[PDB]
């Protein structure tokens, strides 16, 4: 018999992104080659099969720094991290290959799906 | 020029609620009289003006335990905590007064709004 507030989930995510911009309660640094990205472990787990696996691990859950595979593109990661916190994906001709490869590595199935559909339309 | 995934914010919130149920990465206990509620500080801040104020405070931000005013009803808090993590509000005739008073204390304006409208319709 519950009632539901339609905009609640979007409002929560907007405030989680505000916390990220202000660097409040961030508990991990993701290192992608020469670049660093601060984030909330809970948000990363909620969006990515890879981070969900990493942060449920009894040893890795306590790490303050996570280094990604050297093949991962920093811009691709940045675009996906922005997507995690906003639901918006900056998908462009110049970045689609890097975004799709990063999404496959991060196990973000909906992003992989759309990257596949956008590439198929161009061939 | 971004594209947007409609269900993303709802999917994030569902996984944050799964983390709460499994007690993963919870970093605070909210004490309401004889009852205890584990939660994520980031979610509490994202939903409540009161917790936003508390956890941006340079001293309170590091506390693992927060005690609420003894006038706060544990059931009212439980209903609001469930709302924070799901967008669903279990608003009933028997609990509406406690829910509205708790929402005013927690500074959850949209919940206060609806409680006011539901009481006005019954008078």
């Amino acid at each position: 018999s519950c009632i539901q507030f339609t905009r609640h989930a979007s409002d929560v995510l907007l405030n989680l992104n505000r916390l990220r911009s202000r660097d409040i309660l961030t508990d991990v640094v993701i290192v992608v080659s020469r670049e660093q990205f601060r984030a909330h472990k809970t948000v990363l787990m909620a969006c990515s099969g890879l981070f969900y696996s990493i942060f449920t691990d009894q040893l890795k859950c306590n790490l303050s720094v996570i280094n990604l595979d050297p093949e991962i593109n920093p811009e691709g990661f940045c675009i996906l991290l922005d997507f995690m916190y906003t639901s918006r994906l900056n998908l462009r001709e110049g970045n689609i290959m890097a975004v799709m490869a990063t999404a496959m590595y991060l196990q973000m199935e909906h992003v992989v799906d759309t990257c596949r559909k956008f590439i198929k339309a161009s061939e | 020029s971004c594209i947007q995934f409609t269900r993303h914010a709802s999917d994030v919130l569902l996984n944050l609620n799964r983390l709460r149920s499994r007690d993963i990465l919870t970093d605070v206990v909210i004490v309401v009289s004889r009852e205890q509620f584990r939660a994520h500080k980031t979610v509490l801040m994202a939903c409540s003006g009161l917790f936003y104020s508390i956890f941006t405070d340079q001293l309170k931000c590091n506390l693992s335990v927060i005690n609420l005013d003894p006038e706060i009803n544990p059931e009212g808090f439980c209903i609001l905590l469930d709302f924070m993590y799901t967008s669903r509000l279990n608003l009933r005739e028997g609990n509406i007064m406690a829910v509205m008073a708790t929402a005013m204390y927690l500074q959850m304006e949209h919940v206060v709004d609806t409680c006011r409208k539901f009481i006005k319709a019954s008078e």
Binding site: C2, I3, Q4, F5, T6 | -
Partner: peptide, 4 residues
């Protein structure tokens, strides 16, 4: 607010 809606009936879900």
């Amino acid at each position: 607010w809606v009936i879900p």
